[PDB]
Amino acid sequence: MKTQVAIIGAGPSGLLLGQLLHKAGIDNVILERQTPDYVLGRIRAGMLEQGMVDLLREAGVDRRMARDGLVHEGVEIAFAGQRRRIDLKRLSGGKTVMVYGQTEVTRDLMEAREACGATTVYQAAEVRLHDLQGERPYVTFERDGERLRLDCDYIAGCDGFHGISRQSIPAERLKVFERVYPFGWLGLLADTPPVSHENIYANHPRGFALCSQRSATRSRYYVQVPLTEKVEDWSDERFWTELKARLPAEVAEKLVTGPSLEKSIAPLRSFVVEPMQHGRLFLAGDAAHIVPPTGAKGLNLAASDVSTLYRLLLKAYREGRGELLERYSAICLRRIWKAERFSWWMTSVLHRFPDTDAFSQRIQQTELEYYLGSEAGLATIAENYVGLPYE
């Protein structure tokens, strides 16, 4: 097989890059280890920045999102008996966020890719990269018993955190920045109407809680839990009871509960690798970095990475200077770290940390009081929440 850009992974990163390159005229093929049904089996929600929204329109996959998508002009933070709404639209200057799940985005992208007949190879196992600093890089994999080879000019590592792409770079070339938080999120997806038309973050002494949406008949809730916890010790019953205890009464009153469609515990991690590339290999999305989901930034960061790689690959294949591709890591990392900072801040002020002292609690409380009580403070949250202007 011959292509111009070999893409590893058919997640939202790889698919979006694939479709963007398609419109541009750049040949590309995607290799996915799992099956389409499995990738779509991944039930992850989604809050979208306008940057990602507009990027889906440019890729031509905006029709269904324009229909099923839900716009939020604001978001709520609850703490210390208070409920404070952040007017995102007003504070950021017209900008908003979009409720549209990653599962839907991934579906939409697949449909556009199948519809246009672009190349995608699922069940591609033992994926291995070759000659990365060489001039004829190539990929090798096995499906249906046969061993194939995909020749290429460039390789896009969009194979997520546990992908082979990052592990294909010599470790001596990479520096890893990592923070593991002492808690996880116990999440529950239910076929119930959301308690609020905007999302609600809650800092409660018992722990963090989050009320979120998917459709308008499907809700997504989280409560922070210790990593000592196992999902089997948490009935739907126990979940709703804890969630209600961590919410304002006037919210818990209005809360429609129900059976769990999905119930899982997710650990919170920060992760960044520098640089994000090696020769003809470019990492994007979870392959390069992880954020705690408190900021809802991982998928949006994946988008910005892909947007940068797409536009550099354009100026490369067109203007014959595949040298601007050296600027990939520096450009992405500037935005990645700003996302890591906000996601870290959000996590730091909304969660309860073990073995913290009285001073830390008061500082956390004062952080919320100041930033939610100041027009400037509110603006710093808002502009980060909707997404800072692209680079």
Ligand SMILES: Cc1cc2nc3c(=O)[nH]c(=O)nc-3n(C[C@H](O)[C@H](O)[C@H](O)COP(=O)(O)OP(=O)(O)OC[C@H]3O[C@@H](n4cnc5c(N)ncnc54)[C@H](O)[C@@H]3O)c2cc1C
């Ligand atoms: C609970 C939770 C809530 C979140 N909420 C938000 C939110 O509200 N807003 C937001 O912007 N982000 C959110 N995120 C972040 C988002 O889910 C991820 O950042 C996003 O999935 C990253 O996409 P990706 O394509 O880079 O990686 P992935 O989605 O993991 O895709 C990687 C693909 O590559 C495949 N693959 C792996 N290894 C190989 C291999 N060797 N060979 C071939 N293929 C391979 C995988 O099967 C997979 O299909 C949330 C995350 C979690 C866990």
Ligand SMILES: Cc1cc(C(=O)O)ccc1O
């Ligand atoms: C607001 C938000 C929502 C989700 C979700 O919809 O699951 C995850 C993380 C978030 O910060």
